[PDB]
Structure 1
Amino acid sequence: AFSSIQNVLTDAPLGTPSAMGFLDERTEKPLMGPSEMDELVYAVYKQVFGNAHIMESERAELRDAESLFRYLRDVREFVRALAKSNAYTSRFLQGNQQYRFFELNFKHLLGRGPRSLEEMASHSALYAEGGFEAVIDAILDSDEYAQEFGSTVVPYCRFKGEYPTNEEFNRMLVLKGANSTSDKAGKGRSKLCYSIAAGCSQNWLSMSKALPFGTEKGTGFNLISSSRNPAARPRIGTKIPGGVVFSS
C-alpha cells in the first residue's frame, strides 16, 4: 500500500470536510455553503453516471435526491438514491447484458474491478432472489465500501498499490477509460465478459490508454504477442561453480 501514483500523478479525492460534525449537537455539518455543494453534486453526477451527458429535462427528476443531500450531508445515501432512479437504470440496465450491469456497478460505486468469477456469481444469485435493488444495497452497505470511501467522499477509482489480485488492477483500468469516454460505446457486450469467465487478462493498449499522465505508458512491449502461454515449460538454469543446474 504505497499508491506510487495516487496522490502525485492524480488529484486528491473530493467530498465533505469531515465526519466530526455528524455528531450533531447544534448542526449536522459545517454549512459548506451552496457554492461548494453544487460542485460536490456535479462531481457525484460525473461519477455515479460516469459522463452520461444528462440533459436538464433528465436532471429535473433528480431534484428530490439532491434536495435531501444538501440538507443531510451523507454522500453514501445520495448515491443510494441515485442508483435506484430511472436515470440510472434506463442507462445501465435497459439495453445491456447482465454482467455488463454488474461490472458497471463496480466502476461506479466501488471504483475497482471484479476480482473473480465467484464475485460475479454471488451478485447473480443476489439479483435473482428478488431484485436489483438488493445488488446496490449489498454493494453500498458493504464492508469494502466502508473501508474505502465511507460517508464522506465521492467513490473514486483509487490506485491502491497493494491489490488483492493483479487482475483486479487490469480490470479497473479497462472499465475506467480516458476522460471523454462514456459507458454506451458498446451496445451492452461487457468488456470483461470473456476475460472473467476464462481467467485471462485484457488488452495492454486499452489499459495503457486509461493511465494518468507521465507514467511511461505503453512502452516496454516486446514485438511478439502479449498473452502468456499457460502450457509453456521453459528451462532456466542457475549458475554454479561447476556448472548450471536446472532446479525445476
Structure 2
Amino acid sequence: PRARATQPGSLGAKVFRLNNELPSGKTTNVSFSESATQKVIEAAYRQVFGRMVYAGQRQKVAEIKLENGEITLREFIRALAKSDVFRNTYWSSLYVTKAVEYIHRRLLGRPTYGRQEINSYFDTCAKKGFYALVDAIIDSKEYEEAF
C-alpha cells in the first residue's frame, strides 16, 4: 500500500504526467511545451470519455484554463467528468449502480472492491447527486495517493 503511487513499467499502461507545467510568456514558435501539453490533454480526454470526443463536444474552456496554468490536472479531469457530454453518455443512459461502477472504473482506474464502498458512493449519489459522486471519487485518498 506504499506502492500505490509506483507506476508499472512495460507490464501495464503508460502514465501521463503534466510535469513540465507549460510555462511561457513570450513563447518561441517552435516551443516544444504546448505540444506536450496537447498530448496530456489528449490523454485526459481519452481516459475520461474512453475515446476522443467529437469535435463540437470537447471543452475548450477547461483546456484553455489548463494551458494557462490556473487549474491542476485533477481539477481539469473533474471539469471533464462533470461535463454534460460525460453525464449524458455514461450517467444518464445507464442504471445508477452500473453508472457508479463505470464512473469508478473510469476515474479511479479500477473496479470497486466491495459493498461498503458502493453503499457510500451511491449514498453520495442519493442525498446529493452525480456531481457529488464525481466530487467524492476525485476526493478519495486512493485518487490522491495513486495520481
**Scaled by the length of structure 1, what TM-score is found?**
0.50
Between Structure 1 and Structure 2, whose CA radius of gyration is higher? Answer: 1
| Shift in Å, 1:47 | 0.1
Match of 1:17 in 2: 19
| Shift in Å, 1:30 | 5.2
| Shift in Å, 1:139 | 1.0
- The CA deviation string for residues 20-76 of structure 1, in whole angstroms up to 9 with x for no partner, is xxxxxxxxx45371111111111111100012x5211112xx011111011126110
How far apart, CA to CA, are the structure 2 residues paired with 1:126 and 1:35?
38
How far apart, CA to CA, are the structure 1 residues paired with 2:116 and 2:13?
33
- Segments of 5+ residues of structure 2 without an aligned counterpart are 24-31
Match of 1:44 in 2: 44
**Residue 77, structure 1, aligned to residue 79, structure 2:** no
| Shift in Å, 1:108 | 1.2
| Shift in Å, 1:77 | 0.3
Q: Paired residue for 1:8, among 7, 10, 17?
A: 10
| SS at structure 2 position matched to 1:37 | helix
Matches within 5 A, 1:28-43: 29=21, 31=23, 33-43=33-43
How far apart, CA to CA, are the structure 2 residues paired with 1:47 and 1:84?
14
| SS at structure 2 position matched to 1:125 | helix
**Residue 66, structure 1, aligned to residue 63, structure 2:** yes
Match of 2:94 in 1: 96
Amino acid at match of 1:34: E
- Would you say the 8 A contact 2:90–2:103 is kept in 1? no
| Shift in Å, 1:133 | 1.1
| SS at structure 1 position matched to 2:102 | helix
Matches within 5 A, 1:216-235: none
**Residue 146, structure 1, aligned to residue 144, structure 2:** yes
| Shift in Å, 1:13 | 1.0
Match of 2:109 in 1: 111
Amino acid at match of 1:70: E
How far apart, CA to CA, are the structure 2 residues paired with 1:115 and 1:11?
21
- Would you say the 8 A contact 2:100–2:121 is kept in 1? yes
How far apart, CA to CA, are the structure 2 residues paired with 1:141 and 1:10?
25
Matches within 5 A, 1:190-229: none
Amino acid at match of 1:64: V
**What is the count of residue pairs matched by the alignment?**
135
How far apart, CA to CA, are the structure 2 residues paired with 1:139 and 1:40?
21
| Shift in Å, 1:138 | 1.0
**Scaled by the length of structure 2, what TM-score is found?**
0.82
State, as a whole percentage, how many aligned pairs show the same letter.
29
